[PDB]
Amino acid sequence: AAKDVKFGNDARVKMLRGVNVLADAVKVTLGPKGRNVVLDKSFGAPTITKDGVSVAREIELEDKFENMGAQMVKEVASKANDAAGDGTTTATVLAQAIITEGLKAVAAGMNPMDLKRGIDKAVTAAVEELKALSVPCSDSKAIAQVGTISANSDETVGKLIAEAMDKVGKEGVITVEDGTGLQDELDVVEGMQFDRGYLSPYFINKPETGAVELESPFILLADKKISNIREMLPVLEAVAKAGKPLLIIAEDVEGEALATLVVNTMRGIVKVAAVKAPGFGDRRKAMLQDIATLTGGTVISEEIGMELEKATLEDLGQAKRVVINKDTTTIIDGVGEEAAIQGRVAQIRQQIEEATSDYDREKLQERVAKLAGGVAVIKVGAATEVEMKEKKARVEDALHATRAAVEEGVVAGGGVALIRVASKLADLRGQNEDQNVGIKVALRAMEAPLRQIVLNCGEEPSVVANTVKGGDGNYGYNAATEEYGNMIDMGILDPTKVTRSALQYAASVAGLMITTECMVTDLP
Amino acid sequence: AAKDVKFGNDARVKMLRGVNVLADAVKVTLGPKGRNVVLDKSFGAPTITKDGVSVAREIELEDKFENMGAQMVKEVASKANDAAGDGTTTATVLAQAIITEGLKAVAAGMNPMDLKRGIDKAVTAAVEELKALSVPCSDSKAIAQVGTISANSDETVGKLIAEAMDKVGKEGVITVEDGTGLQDELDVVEGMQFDRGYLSPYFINKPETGAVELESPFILLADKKISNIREMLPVLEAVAKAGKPLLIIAEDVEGEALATLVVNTMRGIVKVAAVKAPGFGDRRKAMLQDIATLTGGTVISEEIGMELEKATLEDLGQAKRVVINKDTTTIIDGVGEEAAIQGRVAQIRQQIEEATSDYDREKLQERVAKLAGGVAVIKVGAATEVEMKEKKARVEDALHATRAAVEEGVVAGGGVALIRVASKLADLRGQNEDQNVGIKVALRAMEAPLRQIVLNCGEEPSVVANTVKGGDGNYGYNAATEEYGNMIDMGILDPTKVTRSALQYAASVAGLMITTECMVTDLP
Amino acid sequence: AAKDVKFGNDARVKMLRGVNVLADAVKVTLGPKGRNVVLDKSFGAPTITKDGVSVAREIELEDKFENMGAQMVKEVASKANDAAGDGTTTATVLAQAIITEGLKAVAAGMNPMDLKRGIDKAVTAAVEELKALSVPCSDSKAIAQVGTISANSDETVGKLIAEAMDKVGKEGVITVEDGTGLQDELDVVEGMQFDRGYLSPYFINKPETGAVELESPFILLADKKISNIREMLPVLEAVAKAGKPLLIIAEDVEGEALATLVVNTMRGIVKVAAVKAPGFGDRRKAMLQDIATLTGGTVISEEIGMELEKATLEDLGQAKRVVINKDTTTIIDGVGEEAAIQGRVAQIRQQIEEATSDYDREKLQERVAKLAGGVAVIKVGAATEVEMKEKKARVEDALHATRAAVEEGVVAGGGVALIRVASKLADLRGQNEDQNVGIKVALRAMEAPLRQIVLNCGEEPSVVANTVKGGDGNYGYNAATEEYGNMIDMGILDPTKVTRSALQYAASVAGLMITTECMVTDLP
Ligand SMILES: Nc1ncnc2c1ncn2[C@@H]1O[C@H](COP(=O)(O)OP(=O)(O)OP(=O)(O)O)[C@@H](O)[C@H]1O
Ligand SMILES: Nc1ncnc2c1ncn2[C@@H]1O[C@H](COP(=O)(O)OP(=O)(O)OP(=O)(O)O)[C@@H](O)[C@H]1O
Ligand SMILES: Nc1ncnc2c1ncn2[C@@H]1O[C@H](COP(=O)(O)OP(=O)(O)OP(=O)(O)O)[C@@H](O)[C@H]1O
Ligand SMILES: [K+]
Ligand SMILES: [K+]
Ligand SMILES: [K+]
Ligand SMILES: [Mg+2]
Ligand SMILES: [Mg+2]
Ligand SMILES: [Mg+2]
């Protein structure tokens, strides 16, 4: 199609316009007194949110060049959310500041590539300064403080997050879902629990709750399909001689074997329950091996050279507790040597280190948690569905910030650490005066977050920034309290990863935008 | 459909308009201080690029006559990128200069074919002068310098390119892909490696990394399908008697044979690993023959008159190392006579010389590299995706320029070589005064590259061109440094192939355009 | 649909408008200083061409009356290109002149049918005069001159055409294709060659070249599909006893026979190569009979009453050389009596004389060339694709003109012969003063070509035409040289067929167009 071509100042003005529109839409949610943004939904009611990336992702402009600017600036928020899950609004504000300063530097007729070089140098120095200024976030108090800061000053969310990591541990998995009541709740599960119920309600040994209870039972891990009873007469006789319950974790059990087992349960011969093997395919085999390791048994598969008829008591795993219900089976305290369990979790961690997809990494981490860690479920409770969405978004932001703080430490929140970095980097000079101008662009830029946080609170961004600059260390301005003091002491902790990634992505997008001279787009 | 027909001056003005629009869009990226262009993408965010052909290929004009002008001038950039992969912006600038001068000459009422003849004569003489002025580029310093020049003054890209060429060698293959971190990395593989993993995780002899290790093993190259164990009882017994590991590179292994082999591995009988034969079809047979030559074995195929049951230890290839993982198998230091390997690579090179498609040539060169050379992979690391694209484009341009410089030598960069050629070709005269006008058209034209390079730097193209003309040899104007000096000294090297091809394509397009008088296009 | 109807002068003005538009578009490429035209291509790049029929075929007008006038005048160029392949622009100019003069006469009360009668009489007399003035073009110098004239003053094209005709001969076939380099090349093939490679790479006795070489081999021509080896046990044993190589030109060879033959090759028993029979269907049978005649063998078919098992050494053709590669097999110096070969080519020539389709005629001529003549391939080399197209069009025009000159002789080029004819026909009178007006119309008309050729050179068409008329014989005006002299001596030779056909078609279209009084067309 025929193309519209822009050169020089027109394209730069269009980028500035799109960036300014997107940043103005996003930044109103920054800081403790940032307000909410409601996004129209064609299919359903409009959604109320405070997350900056959510607001940024819904921005599109009729003007094609300004649309280009909005798209290129949205990458900062997108990548900031992708990396740490927090500071997306701070990332957008930083990007807008860098874009503004660099464009007005370009307007002087001066070389844009040298501006990009200076901005990159200054931002690398800023990342180093932030890493040096990072202080570890390991205590539950600091975790709760980080969660509160990221959840828009919500102590309950940070407290629940710290409790989840404390109960579950570092190697466990913590997830957030919607609740049924008006309050949040936390559930912790240890051991292996897989979403596989009993294959027959007649296996239920307690009609009051409809559950199957197995005390110190054998576990037959069949990596195969059980179709005929004849394949498992030997193991059934072995179980009957042993007299202990049996749990058959198989791919599935057909009608004949299921009928025989349910008959034998109420005939008093063998107390046998049958459940399906969790997972599908290679993940099913991996989970079966995990169950074998934790229960000290051998998975029954034809691919290794053994048959179900040849299986004996040794090939049967053992566990202290087997809980079964309509949906889930939990194997609690299986007899498993810690050597095999730790070897298996080491193999899973090695696979994690060679896992690129986040889904595979999460599944492997959940497998480790079932083997060694735990599973936490946090249900969000409130009255309405918009409150569902907003509170869940705040909880997820708090969880991301808490994890980032745990893994990388904390720094003074509210843009105070960035002001300290700017003070420490006022001496940086590049290859020429042009890279010096780029460095000064970055230095003027990273003071934007505190200024915008204060602006959302209705106070003076300039006076606050000047007073914070006159201070040192963690001295700064609590925007929720509107008072000058130490950010670390009064709980204003920002993850170092969040700020560092936000600044890096903002700089990377803005420096390349600086060198723009021309656009080719479609005709309106 | 009804056709719009133009004649004479209006049509030539339309061609000049389209050429000027396309050249103005392209030339902003020329020179070390050239700026880059952001191109809007309908599917995704706009892409920031500095490659001239990339900007040229996105140009389309609403006016059908100017659209034809843009299309006909785009051929210069397209062919320049196709030939050497660099100098596309220089090609576009040269084409625009030749078009402008030739159309101006036509505006005087003089025969256009005489301009075409004079331009062709002058450009042929210029190609001869560039070939004579070409100095070889074999040292790694010159290669790194060429890469830096083509990568928009990036020393790291040229250094990595020189390192890859040195480690891998001349007959190897070097490729560039995107990385995962923020920095570029280089990986070199010597020997033979094919993307085939083990057919069973039970073949893994090291659960820590999930890999199969075979030390001094036999190699059974089956150019067939292995279905029954009975076909390989003789070779299995021979391997067991030998006691050395075995690697079966076959088309595929079914369930029965795979189960038997995995059983025998953990039963201690034979340490056997099975992988699929790389390639599909005739290329699979060629790769199997390559493996046979490198490992000194015989490929097992029914088309030659021998059977798998009749195969013995002699038909089994041997190698010092066999590495297998989930995806790849490397045969390291196979026992292969250099006579057979060199004959095979000679046959592959003969096929290359009779290979028209670039894909077939690349595959054959990769086969030679596996047999004799190596494989280099350069991962581009940076914060954002637009930086992915821009840095990878710069790296690819640098790689193309370095290869062109290695194969054809270097000349003084920044358009100095063309100015020297113009000084040496000021005496050329054609069949008539009109062909002399065409020669002067070409002579005025090839001074355009330095002028545009300096213009992108904000200095005086005319003063710079005059000062360079007053100089001699490689004396010129470093546009990045903005200083006069010998371009060879500070590393401003341009491949002779790049400039020669660019000038040839520009002249060939422009000379044929000049003789145009009439236009037939569709009605708007 | 409702029809728009025109009568009398308005319809004739519409005819003249369409004719004039098409002729003005076409005639800009006439003569040595004719221009080039760029035609817009919706699917691909616009094409630069100088061929008159190519420009004519792309002309369409919005006005339906002028559009149908353009359609009827396009028939002159179309038929001129169909007949001789050259002089299409001359045909268009002649048609425009005849149309203009006839319409001018009609406007004065002329009887249009009498104009048609007089024009036909004068043009028939002109054709007779051109035939009488034709001088044979048999020397390679005249052929090269004709090619140069038709290739827009390109000596190389005419020289290559003459060389191809000399090497290949009169009964051979010469074709023009695009090359890979920057220069034209000529390849001549004698004997017979068919595009069939070896059926197995194991047949290759020369792996360095990947070719099957057979010295004094038997030739088994199987007009059948061979499936089982048992069919060639007799002839395989006969060949083994003979000990000479064997080439099986069959419809195809299946897996069992191919495997047995490839086994027997490397076993040193029989040197057997297998290739597919060229052609499909009746043409395959004819080509197999051609191979039998040239190699002195018998084609093995079931339709005659003999079987492959009953075939002996006598049924096997013999030859001196058999060349096979991945694609082609050539039989060089087959032992074939000239009686059978000449009888076969006589039958093919008889089929040619009864062949209406040009494709069948070309295939039969190629069969004769394989049996008796040769095959020439001329590759066009140049930098760009538009130059591919333009140079190939010039080469094809030169080839057509050279063939027409060889078959019918030459006359003075540049419209000089037409002026001589007009001078010789100034005395022709028809049935009445009306047919005299028609004759004068034609006489005024055929002086147009030289006038337009000179007009394309920027000189005076009237002064040039007057000076040429004042001359005699081949005295005329070299428009490329702009000098008066003999056309024949300086190499401006025009094929008599080209000019005669052009004039005939122009007269036939124009005389009928003159007799029109009413138009019926669609409503806009
Ligand atoms: N009491 C406070 N005093 C000063 N600054 C504060 C205070 N509470 C929060 N902040 C700052 O305000 C910001 C928190 O705003 P908010 O959580 O809405 O957005 P964000 O951290 O930029 O990212 P996201 O859009 O992903 O939620 C951080 O920069 C934080 O340091
Ligand atoms: N320091 C320098 N001083 C002078 N000229 C330079 C310098 N560095 C590069 N050049 C010139 O500038 C040009 C390099 O620009 P650039 O690499 O962007 O485009 P290109 O070589 O025309 O091709 P492409 O569009 O394929 O990248 C070359 O003509 C080179 O000779
Ligand atoms: N040097 C010359 N001096 C005079 N007339 C010439 C000269 N060279 C060519 N001509 C004339 O010019 C014409 C050749 O032009 P051109 O080959 O472009 O078109 P054409 O022969 O009419 O047909 P086509 O359109 O098929 O190419 C012929 O009439 C030829 O006699
Ligand atoms: K926010
Ligand atoms: K460029
Ligand atoms: K022509
Ligand atoms: Mg936040
Ligand atoms: Mg370049
Ligand atoms: Mg012609």
Author numbering:
A (entry chain D), B (entry chain E), C (entry chain F): 2 to 525
Please give sentences taken from the publication describing this entry.
The bacterial chaperonin GroEL cooperates with its cofactor GroES in assisting the folding of roughly 10% of newly synthesized proteins, including proteins with α/β topology that fail to fold spontaneously. GroEL is a cylindrical complex of around 800 kDa containing two heptameric rings of 57 kDa subunits stacked back to back. The apical domains mediate substrate protein (SP) binding and the equatorial domains mediate ATP binding and hydrolysis. ATP-dependent binding of the lid-shaped GroES (a heptamer of 10 kDa subunits), capping the SP-containing ring (the cis-ring), results in the burial of hydrophobic surfaces on GroEL and displaces the bound protein into an enclosed chamber.
In cells growing at 37 °C, EL–ES1 and EL–ES2 complexes occurred at an approximate ratio of 60:40%. The relative abundance of EL–ES1 and EL–ES2 complexes in tomograms was about 55% and 45%, respectively, similar to growth without MetK overexpression. EL+ cells grew essentially as wild-type (WT) but contained only free GroEL (EL complex) and EL–ES1 (around 90% and 10% of total GroEL, respectively) and no EL–ES2 complexes. The in situ structure of EL–ES2 at the given resolution showed no major deviations from the crystal structure of the non-cycling symmetrical complex with bound ADP–BeFx (PDB 4PKO33). At 37 °C growth, the relative proportions of these species were largely independent of MetK overexpression, with a subset of EL–ES2 complexes containing structured SP in both chambers. In WT cells, EL–ES2 complexes are also functional.
